[PDB]
Every structure is written in structure tokens, then in C-alpha cells.
């Protein structure tokens, strides 16, 4: 025979989205072409990011967009998001932004446009810049989800600040034998 191990023989990654959305698949049909037929790897990253799941493309907020476009050097560039540019109400003055996301929520659209900005989609993005140059690609906060407060080294195991699955935060609900030192032992 041959002594291969066939355990990891299959790459797990996505070839296509698991959505039957049709505007998303037409964006896929455009970026399959641009990634297959340009040499720029922005199109391969945008192809792989249109492929992803809702929890793999998290929404960055307008505050992250403001800060990460105010980093010096990338003036009058084009922010490129594959998730959702949501509004962030704890910012007041918004600069002129040139954004490109799949979906921008309503008051964030009003905010950017009356700041004086311009909101593109990916089709007119690819008409504006096919190799995608002059673009700052950005991502949402991906460990921002609350399900990551439960992940990692278990609770009840020292040096591990993992939130446990408790049906109610209270006084009687997991405070006693592993948490105290007067009751039992502390970790």
C-alpha cells in the first residue's frame, strides 16, 4: 500500500457560501472572476470574506471605522468591509468617509451621508477599483461575541476567568464551594 494517514486529507474551508441569497451569489460571481483573473490578493481576501458565515464576518461599528481610518497615512482612501457598518452612537463628529460594505444600517447611512461621505456597494466598488487599490480592508471585532466568555480553560480550574453557564446571575447561583475559601476551596 502506501503509508499515508488520510485524517487531514481534506481541507475543511468553504468553496461557496451556505446562503441561497442571490445578491450575495452575484457578488460571488463577480469576485470569483476578479480573484481568478487579477494578480491582486485583495480580491482573494474579499472572495474568502464573502464566502464566510455571519459569525465569521462580525459587524464593525462606525467608531472602529473612524479610528482605524484616522490612523495616519490612509487619508482619502476607501474603507472596505464585508460585514455590516453599524452606527455607533457614542461618537459625535463624523469625517468624510468612503465606505464599501454589504449592508449599512439606516441611521449609519444617514450619519455618513450627511457627514458628506459616500456609501458604495461591492459592484460599483469593483467598477471603481478592480484590483482594489486605494482601499483599507477592515474587520469587525470577532472575539466580541458573548459566547467567547465561555470558551477556553474551564471554570473550576485555577487561573481561568471563564464565565460559566449559570441560569441566573445571583447570590445563590454558583458562589459557594469552588468560589469561596470559607466554603471548601478556591480556584
Amino acid at each position: 500500500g502506501v503509508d499515508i494517514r488520510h485524517n487531514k486529507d481534506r481541507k475543511v474551508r468553504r468553496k461557496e457560501p451556505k446562503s441561497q441569497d442571490i445578491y450575495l451569489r452575484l457578488l460571488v460571481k463577480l469576485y470569483r472572476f476578479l480573484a481568478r483573473r487579477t494578480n491582486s490578493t485583495f480580491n482573494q481576501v474579499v472572495l474568502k470574506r464573502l464566502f464566510m458565515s455571519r459569525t465569521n464576518r462580525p459587524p464593525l461599528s462606525l467608531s472602529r471605522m473612524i479610528r482605524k481610518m484616522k490612523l495616519p497615512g490612509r487619508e482619502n482612501k476607501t474603507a472596505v468591509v464585508v460585514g455590516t457598518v453599524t452606527d455607533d452612537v457614542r461618537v459625535q463628529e463624523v469625517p468624510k468617509l468612503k465606505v464599501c460594505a454589504l449592508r449599512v444600517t439606516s441611521r449609519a447611512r444617514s450619519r455618513i451621508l450627511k457627514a458628506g461621505g459616500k456609501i458604495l456597494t461591492f459592484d460599483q466598488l469593483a467598477l471603481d477599483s478592480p484590483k482594489g487599490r486605494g482601499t483599507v480592508l477592515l474587520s469587525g471585532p470577532r472575539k466580541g461575541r458573548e459566547v467567547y466568555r465561555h470558551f477556553g480553560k474551564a471554570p473550576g480550574t485555577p487561573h481561568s476567568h471563564t464565565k460559566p453557564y449559570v441560569r441566573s446571575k445571583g447570590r445563590k447561583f454558583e458562589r459557594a464551594r469552588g468560589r469561596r475559601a470559607s466554603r471548601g476551596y478556591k480556584n
Partner: protein, 124 residues
């Protein structure tokens, strides 16, 4: 548009027909009668179709005009060609080529016109 309509009609249309590990599309202006984006007779701004005439001789060639897209009555134009087999095919060839009118399927129209004319000369 056209791709937007194709992403709907590609699987849940009524002209589609799926059996015997084949697939076809029974729509009224489909050269080669098969389910494809290239040949579909409903989702384009310009489309030819090759039909046998109501009189039992010759070919009515259907063109889709440019202006009245959303107006299905004054959208298609019929031309009846009742000639020999050479000039019928030459007329369909010039009509699709020299108008630059959707030249993806000039040869499919010529095949379909020839198959109709084969079936329209008498049987053995």
C-alpha cells in the same frame, strides 16, 4: 436585470423539465430548448426564436425588440420566411450577424431552422 432573473428562473421555473438525468426548458423562444443562461428566451433584452409557421411551409423568426421590455404584447416581432432552404438560412444568418443582434446563437438558430425545414419537407 438578466442575471437576477436567471437566479430565480434557473431552478423553480415551470418551463424547466427534469427527468432521465437530462434537463430542458420548454419556453417559447429557446433555441436548442435547453436550460441555460445563454439560450433562455425570457430574461434577455434581445432574443431570437425559430418557429414553424401556421401555414405548413417555412419559418417564422421571432426577434425581441429593444424599447418595450415590460410591454409583452408589442415586444416580439415576427417575420415569416417561406423560401428555399439556402436563402432561409442566409436570411437568418444575415439577420443575426449583420444586426449584431445577440450573436451567441446565430448558429443555433441556423441548426433549428434547418431541423424545421427537414421536418417540413415530406416524410419518407
Amino acid at each position: 436585470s438578466a442575471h437576477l432573473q436567471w437566479m430565480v428562473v434557473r431552478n423553480c421555473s415551470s418551463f424547466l423539465i427534469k427527468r432521465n438525468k437530462q434537463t430542458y426548458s420548454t419556453e417559447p423562444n429557446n433555441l436548442k430548448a435547453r436550460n441555460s443562461f445563454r439560450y433562455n428566451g425570457l430574461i434577455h433584452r434581445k432574443t431570437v426564436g425559430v418557429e414553424p409557421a401556421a401555414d405548413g411551409k417555412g419559418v417564422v423568426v421571432v426577434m425581441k425588440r429593444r424599447s418595450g421590455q415590460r410591454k409583452p404584447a408589442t415586444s416580439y416581432v415576427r417575420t415569416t420566411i417561406n423560401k428555399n432552404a439556402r436563402a432561409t438560412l442566409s436570411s437568418i444568418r444575415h439577420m443575426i450577424r449583420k444586426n449584431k443582434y445577440h450573436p451567441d446563437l446565430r448558429m443555433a438558430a441556423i441548426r433549428r431552422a434547418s431541423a424545421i425545414l427537414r421536418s417540413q419537407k415530406p416524410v419518407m
